[PDB]
Symmetry: D2
Subunit: 464 residues, 4 copies
C-alpha cells in the first residue's frame, strides 16, 4: 504494498505435467550447452523455478496453427504469396491494452489489404506481438549510467536501479501478458474488425486527412472499386476465410523459449518439439552466432524461423544458416531477413541471394528496411528517416527483380497510434516534433499514417 | 520478485481511463451500493488496487461475440435451437492446463453433436470455463473447522487456515488464468479438434468401452450415418460454421465483475456496459436476492444472463426476475435455470412456466439437473446419483411437452477426465469407488463417460 | 424432297394435356379480342392446329426462373443493380448454331464483367435469344417487290415468293430452335465459359488487337487487378453463384406467345399465367397500342415486361403504360425502354421520367441506343453510326444524373462475330466496308469489338 | 408447310463444316464400315439428308459436362461413389411432356437421396432420357404380323403397317424431342425441385400411402433426421452442389450418333470426338458384336460408355471388351452392365468379375436387374416380377461382397407415374391389374412406388 503503489501477485506453485521425451530432451540439452549471447543475468535457481511454472501453462499457440503457417510460408517462398510482418519494437506490459493491441492489429490489416491488391497474391500476416518482450542491447551501461533496459521480460523501462535488476518473475509476467494479448488478437481477427468492408473508411479517412493524400487517392480508389466489384459478384464476408494474424517475436531469452516447448499430437504424423510461445520466431543480428545456442535452439524446433542479416553478412555464412536451419529442404521453413541500410542493400544483398539460391533451397527473402537505417537526432532521440526506410525496400525490390528471385516480404516496426518517432513521411515529422509523442520503449516505429503510406508505396513497387 | 515467488505490478504508472456516461455511472454505483451476499472479506483498499490492475488488461471476451451469442440464444428461446452449458463446478488454477481444458472442450463438443442429432436443431455451446473461480457456500466454517473454501478467486483449497484467508491478489491470478484458458479454447475451436468427423471415433470408442455400449450403439451408428450422409452430399469442413464455444461463469465476486466492465462503441446505437470477463454469466441460488447487488448488477450489463431457480421459487417471483432482467422483451436475454430435485421438478416447475409464459416474454428454460440432487455418501463424499440426474431432465421434458413449451437446454457439471465423483452410470460407480479419483474442488462432476451417456439419454428425450 | 434439297419433317399430332383454368382462359380471351397489329396472315385453322401442338410441349423456361429474374429486376429498379440486354436483332434458324450462340453468350458475359466493374453493382444478363424470331415491318412490300420478311417464325429471308409466304409450321420450327438454343445457353452458363477467369484473356486480346486499345488498357488492367485481388482473398470459381443468362424476345406473334402460356405450381403462392417461351418479353414500338392485344396480353402474364418508347412518346401515355402494366406497384415488373435518337434523348426523355417517377411506381429505365439511330448508307445498307449509339447512352445518363433517377440498363443489338454492320468504332468501319460481312437478317448489330468497346465506354459513364 | 403437317428445312444453304483431323476421319470411317446389327432400313440418300441437318444443330450436351461425368464415374469405379441410372425403356414423342419428364426427374432424385444415405457416399444420377428413342428387337415381325416397333427414332408405335415403316425424318424429330427434354431437365435440376428438403414430404407421402409403409418407416425417419441434422449444422441449399442429372441412352442408331459427333478444342490436349447427343451411352446386348460397328464406334468417342452383359457372357470376352474400350486404363471410362437373371447372377457373375479385376483396369460394375427377368403373362403382357428384380440386385451384392469388389450401381427402368407394368411390390400388382395402366412402348417399368421401394431395399443392401 500500500506504501509503494505496487501489488505483489503470488505465483502459484503447481504440479508438473509429464516431462518431454528423454530423447528430445537429450538433443535440446546438447543444443543449450552452446554459449548464448545477450542473456539475462538472474541466478540459475530462480530461472529454473520460473521455467518450471511455465512448463505446465496453456500454450500461447498450438501446433496445427504452426503447421498451417508453414504451408502459407511455403507459398511465399515459391513466389506465390507475400509476407507482411510488423508491430512494436518492444511490447511493454503497461501498453499491453485493448486499444493498443486493436490499433496494431488494425494497422496490420490495413497494410495487408493494400499490399494484397498491389501484389495480386495473398499476404500472410505476422504480428510482432504476444511475446516481443526482450531486447538485446549494444551497451551494458546506458547514458544515465544504469544497467540497460532489456525489455519487460527481463527488467523495467523506468530509469532507476531497482527497476533495472534482472528479475525472472518477469518470465511469468511475460507469459500472462502474451496469452492475454493473443486471446485478444484471436477475438479481434474473427470480429467485424477483420472484414474487408472496413477498409472503405480506413483508407478514405487516411486519404482525406493526409498531406500527400492526393498522391494515394488513385490507388485507394482502385482498391475501393476492387472491393465493390467482388461484392457485386456475390462475395459476402461469410464467403471468405477468417482473417489470420500470426504471432512472432525474437527468440532471445532461452529460459522463456525452452519453458514454452511442447510435443505435438503425432496425429499429424510424428511428434516433434514446437515452441508454443509463438507461431514463428527469429534470431537477431546479435545472437546469430553459427555455433551459439540461439541457432542451435532454432534447429531443434519445428516452427518456421527467421535470421536477421546485417551488413557484415557474407554469402558463405548465409549458406551455413540455410544448411543448419533448412536441412530437410522445406520451402519457407527459413526466412532470411535483410537489414542492410538503404545505401548498402543494392551492393551487399545480390551476392548473398545468388549464393543461397544456388544451394537449391527455397528461403523467403524478407526486407527489414528499419534496423539498418537508425540514427540519433540532434535533439537526442533514436530515430529513422522515412525516406531511407522506403529507399531500402526499393533497393531490395531492385536486387530481386535483377536476379529473377522473389522479393518475399517486409518486416517493419509500426504502431497504430499517432506517435512521433520516425522523421518524415507525409506529415513531415521534424527533429523538434519527435519530442511530442516519442512513446517507444526501444526503436522508433512508423506511426499509423507512416506505415499506411509505406504500404501504398510498396504496393506501387509490387505493381512493376 | 522471483525470490518472494511474486509478480510485482506498479499501479502509479497506470492512468487514465475515460469516464462512463453519467447515467451508466449512476446506475452502476446504485447497483453496487445494494446488499451483496457471499462476498469475499478482504480490505477495500487492497481490492481497489487489484481492480485498478484489471481495469486496463485485454478483456477475456469482446462485445461483438456477446451480441452474436445473444442472437443465437434468441433462437433457443424461440424453440429453434438447444442450449448446452457445461464444465467444472470449480475451475482451479492447479488444473488450468492444456490436457484438462482440451478434455473439457472435447466432452462438450462430443455431447453437442449427439444433442444436435437428437434435437434436429443447432446446439449452442457454453462452457463453464475461463472464470468459474468463485463459489458461494452454505456455511462459513467447513467440517474441519476451517473457513470454507470459496474457489481460487477467493482462497486456497488446501486444508489449512493460512491458505483459507481471503486474498485479493487472487482477483488478478483469476484473470491471468481465465485469459490463458480462453486463449486456448479459441485455438482449439478453430483446430481439427472441432471437426465433426472426429466424432466417429470418439463415439465409437465410447460405445466399445462402455459397459452399456450395446444400449447406445444404434444411436451412435445413426449419427455416424448422418455425418457420412452430410459428407456424401458434398459438405466438407470448409463449408461449415467454425465451432463456437462461449465462456460463462457465476457472476459472484462483484470486485471482479465490475473491474472487467467495458463500455461498447456506437455500433448498436447507445453505448452499453458489457461484462468482458465472459460471454454470459448467471446469478446463483444464494445471491439472487431480488433487491440485492447481483440482480441489480445484471440489470446494468448487456450480456445474456441466467438465474438459478431452486425449489422454493414461486411463479410470482419468477415473473419479477423476468420483468427486471428482460425489461425490453428481448428473446434470449434471460435464461431461467431450473434446479428442483428429480422428485420435485414435475410438481414445482409447471406453475412457474405457465406464469412466465403468460407475460409474453421469451425466456430460455434450462434444466440444471445437478444442483438439486446432491447428497452426502456414507464414505463422506459430496455426491450425486446418475439416475436422479437423468430423472430430473426427464421430468423437465415432461413438464414442457405437457405445456407445449420449449425445453431449451441443460446446464451440467462435467469433466473430460475419468473421475469418480457421481455414483452410478454404466460404470456403476459405487460409494467405495468414489475414493479412487475424487478430484473436484467443490461439487461432483459427471466424468467423460457419464457426460456422454447423459447426452445420449437426453438425445432420446429430444426424439421422443 | 430429294429434288428440292429440302426435308419435310412431320409434325407429330399428340394428345393434349388438361386445358388452362376456365377463369384464366376467360380473361385471356377478353384480352385477345383486342385488335393486334403486325400479325401474320396465315389462316385461322392452321394457326389453331399449330398452337395446339405447342400447348403441350416442354416449356423453354420455368416459373421459378421467372420469379428469380423478377427479384433481380426489382434490385435494378431500386438502383442497386444494372440491366444488360443484348443479342441478335433477328435470330435465324440457319445461324442458330453452337458457334453463333456461344459467340453471343461470350460477348454478353464479356460486356457484363466490364459493366459490373464500372457500375460497382450486379449486372443482370438478358439475352435476345431463344425466340427472337419475329419482326414487325414498316412496309408490306420490300424494295424487291416482295412481301416483307417478318422473321423466321413467320416466313423466310430468301428473296422469293414461296419463301415469303406466312407459314404457321414455322411456329413449331421456332419452338424447336428456341428450346435447342436455350438448352445450349444453360449448358454454356454452367461451363468454364462463364468463369470470370476467362476475362483475363478476352479483354487482353481485345486490348492487344484493337486500334484504340491504348484508350481501354487502363480500365482493362484495373479489372484484371480487381479479379486477381479477389482470387488473392481466397475467392475461387466454386465460391461464386452460377452465371445466369436469361432469355428474352419481342412478344409479337400472339399465336406463339399464347400457345406457350402455362400455369404455375401454386407451391410459390397462387397459380397465375406465365409465358414460358422466355423469361422476359417486351412490346415493340409498332405494337404498343394502349388498347391493343399486345399490351393486354402483357397485363395477363406474370413475366417481367418491357415497352419500347420512341420519340413520339408523351409523358401521359407513359403513365398509362405504368398503370396498365404495373397495377400492383411491383418494382422491376415494368421496364420502359428509351429509344429516342441521340439528338433527341436529352430533350424528350426528362419530361417522361419526371411524370412516371411522380406516380410512385418503380420502373426500370433502360436505354436502347440503337433503334432510334438507324439510316441507309449511300451503298444501300441499313446501318448505324457507333458514335451516335454511344452519344445516346451518354445523353440517357445525363438525363438521369440531372434528375437523381437510376439509369437502369442498356438494350443493344450485338453479335460475337466480326461483322461489318455498324459504321465506326475503333475499327473505323466505313460505308464501303459494310459489304464484306453484312450478315444480319434485319437491323445492323454491333460486332464483337464494337460491343466490347461500347461496354468500356458505358463503364466510364457509370464511374461518374 | 402447315397444310401438310410438316416442317420444311432447306439443306442447300447449310455448309460448310471444318474437316476432322485426318486420323479421326480414318478411324470413324473404319468404325462405320463394320457390320452393324439392328439398324433401320431407310434409304441412304434420305439418311444423309437428315444427318446433314443434325450436323449443325446445337448439341444436346457439351464436352465439359462429359469430362465432369467421367471424373465422377472414376470415383464410382474406385469404390467411392454409387451410380444410379434410370428412366423409360422407350421414351416416346407422345409422352415427352413437362409432367412426364418432371415425374421421371423426381423419381430419380427421390431414389438418389435414399441410396446416398444407404451408401454413405455420393450417388451419380444418369437418366435414360433426352434420346432413348431407338430399340433393338428380338424379331423383325411382331405378334400382329407387323414390322416390329423399334422406337420413335425409327417408326411409330401405332399397330398399322404405314406407321411401322422406317422413316428417316424421325432422326430430326428425335433430336428436337431430345433437346427440348434436356432443356427442361436442366431447368428442373436448378429449380427448387432438386432441393434435398423436398425429400421429407416425398418419402413421408410414400410411407403413408404404401401398403408396406411400416416396413420402410424406420429408414425414412432416419433419412429425415439426417437431413435435419445437416441443416442444424448450418448447411443450407446455397452451400450444396447444384443437382446434376446426366443424359444417357443406348447408342443404337448409328445415323443419329454419327451426326451428333462434335470435335472438342485444345483444353485436354488432343482434339477428340465427343458424341454430344448424350453424356454417356451404352451398347446393348444385341449390338455388342466385338468386331461390329457399335463397339468400334464406342472406341472412337470420348464419352464414358457401358456394355450390357447377358447370361452368355464369358470372362474372356468381358476382358476383351475392357481392353478394347478402356485401352488407356481410365477408371470410369467403362461400365459393365450385368443383366443375368436373378436365378443366374450368383453363378455367372463371379468368374467374370475375377478375370476383369485381374487385368488391373477399374470398370464400374453396374447391375441391370430388369432385362434378364422378363416374362410373358397369361393376359399377354410383357412383364417382370418385382421379387425377381430385387433378388437379382441382392445376388449382385453378394457376388461383390464375396470378392471384395465394388457393387458400383444399378440400371433400372422406371417412371414417375402410377403404371401397372411390373407385377408385385407392396401394391401386389396382379396379372389382372396389368390391364389398367400398361403404358410402356416397350419393356415394363417400375412405377413411382415400386422404384422407391426398390431404392429402400437397395439402401438396406448397401448398409448390410
Ligand atoms: O452453479 C453452481 O456450482 C452452484 C453454486 C455452487 C454451490 C456450492 C455449494 O456447496 P456446499 O457449501 O453446499 O458444499 O449453483 P446454485 O447457485 O446452487 O444453483
Ligand atoms: O436397355 C434396354 O432397354 C434393352 C434393349 C431393349 C430390348 C428390347 C427387347 O424387346 P423384345 O423384342 O424382346 O419384345 O437392353 P439390353 O440390350 O437387352 O440389355
Ligand atoms: O528486431 C529488433 O528490434 C532488433 C534490434 C533490437 C535491439 C535494440 C537495442 O538497440 P541498441 O539501442 O541497444 O543499440 O533488430 P536486429 O538489429 O537484430 O536486426
Ligand atoms: O427490337 C427491335 O428490333 C425493334 C425493331 C424491329 C423492326 C425491324 C423492321 O424495321 P424496318 O426495316 O421494317 O423499318 O425495335 P423497336 O423499333 O420496336 O423499338
Ligand atoms: Cl483420464
Ligand atoms: Cl399418376
Ligand atoms: Mn527494433
Ligand atoms: Mn456446482
Ligand atoms: Mn432491331
Ligand atoms: Mn428395356
Amino acid at each position: 504494498g500500500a506504501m509503494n503503489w505496487t501489488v505483489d501477485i503470488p505465483i502459484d506453485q503447481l504440479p508438473s505435467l509429464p516431462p518431454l521425451p528423454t530423447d528430445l530432451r537429450t538433443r535440446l540439452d546438447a543444443a543449450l550447452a552452446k554459449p548464448a549471447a545477450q542473456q539475462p543475468t538472474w541466478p540459475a535457481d530462480q530461472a529454473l523455478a520460473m521455467r518450471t511454472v511455465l512448463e505446465s501453462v496453456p500454450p500461447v499457440t498450438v501446433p496445427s496453427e504452426i503447421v498451417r503457417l508453414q504451408e502459407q510460408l511455403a507459398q511465399v517462398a515459391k513466389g506465390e504469396a507475400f509476407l507482411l510482418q510488423g508491430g512494436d519494437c518492444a511490447e511493454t506490459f503497461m501498453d499491453n491494452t485493448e486499444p493498443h493491441i486493436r490499433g496494431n492489429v488494425r494497422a496490420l490489416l490495413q497494410m495487408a489489404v493494400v499490399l494484397t491488391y498491389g501484389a495480386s497474391m495473398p499476404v500472410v500476416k505476422v504480428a510482432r506481438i504476444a511475446g516481443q518482450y526482450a531486447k538485446p542491447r549494444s551497451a551494458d551501461i546506458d547514458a544515465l549510467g544504469l544497467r540497460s533496459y532489456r525489455g519487460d521480460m527481463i527488467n523495467g523501462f523506468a530509469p532507476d536501479a531497482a527497476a533495472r535488476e534482472h528479475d525472472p518473475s518477469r518470465l511469468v509476467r511475460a507469459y500472462a501478458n502474451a496469452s492475454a494479448a493473443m486471446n485478444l488478437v484471436r477475438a479481434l481477427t474473427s470480429s467485424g474488425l477483420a472484414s474487408l468492408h472496413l477498409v472503405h473508411d480506413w483508407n478514405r479517412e487516411f486519404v482525406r486527412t493526409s498531406p500527400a493524400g492526393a498522391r494515394y487517392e488513385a490507388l485507394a480508389t482502385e482498391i475501393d472499386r476492387g472491393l465493390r466489384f467482388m461484392s457485386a459478384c456475390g462475395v459476402a464476408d461469410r464467403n471468405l476465410q477468417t482473417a489470420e494474424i500470426y504471432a512472432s517475436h525474437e527468440a532471445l531469452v532461452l529460459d522463456y523459449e525452452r519453458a514454452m516447448l511442447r510435443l505435438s499430437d503425432g496425429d499429424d504424423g510424428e511428434p516433434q518439439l514446437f515452441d508454443l510461445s509463438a507461431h514463428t520466431v527469429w534470431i537477431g543480428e546479435r545472437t546469430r552466432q553459427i555455433d551459439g545456442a540461439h541457432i542451435a535452439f532454432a534447429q531443434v524446433i519445428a516452427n518456421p524461423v527467421g535470421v536477421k542479416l546485417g551488413p557484415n553478412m557474407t554469402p558463405e555464412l548465409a549458406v551455413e544458416y540455410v544448411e543448419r536451419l533448412d536441412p530437410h529442404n522445406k520451402p519457407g521453413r527459413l526466412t532470411l531477413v535483410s537489414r542492410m541500410g538503404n545505401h548498402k542493400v543494392r551492393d551487399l544483398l545480390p551476392p548473398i541471394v545468388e549464393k543461397v539460391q544456388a544451394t537449391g533451397h527455397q528461403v523467403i527473402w524478407q526486407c527489414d528496411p528499419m534496423h539498418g537505417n537508425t540514427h540519433e537526432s540532434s535533439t537526442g532521440f533514436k530515430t529513422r528517416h522515412f525516406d531511407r526506410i522506403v529507399d531500402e525496400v526499393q533497393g531490395f525490390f531492385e536486387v530481386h527483380r535483377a536476379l529473377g528471385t522473389h522479393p518475399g516480404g517486409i518486416h517493419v516496426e509500426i504502431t497504430g497510434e499517432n506517435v512521433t518517432e520516425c522523421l518524415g513521411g507525409a506529415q513531415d515529422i521534424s527533429e523538434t516534433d519527435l519530442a511530442g509523442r516519442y512513446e517507444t520503449a526501444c526503436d522508433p516505429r512508423l506511426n499509423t499514417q507512416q506505415s499506411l503510406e509505406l504500404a501504398f508505396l510498396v504496393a506501387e513497387m509490387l505493381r512493376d
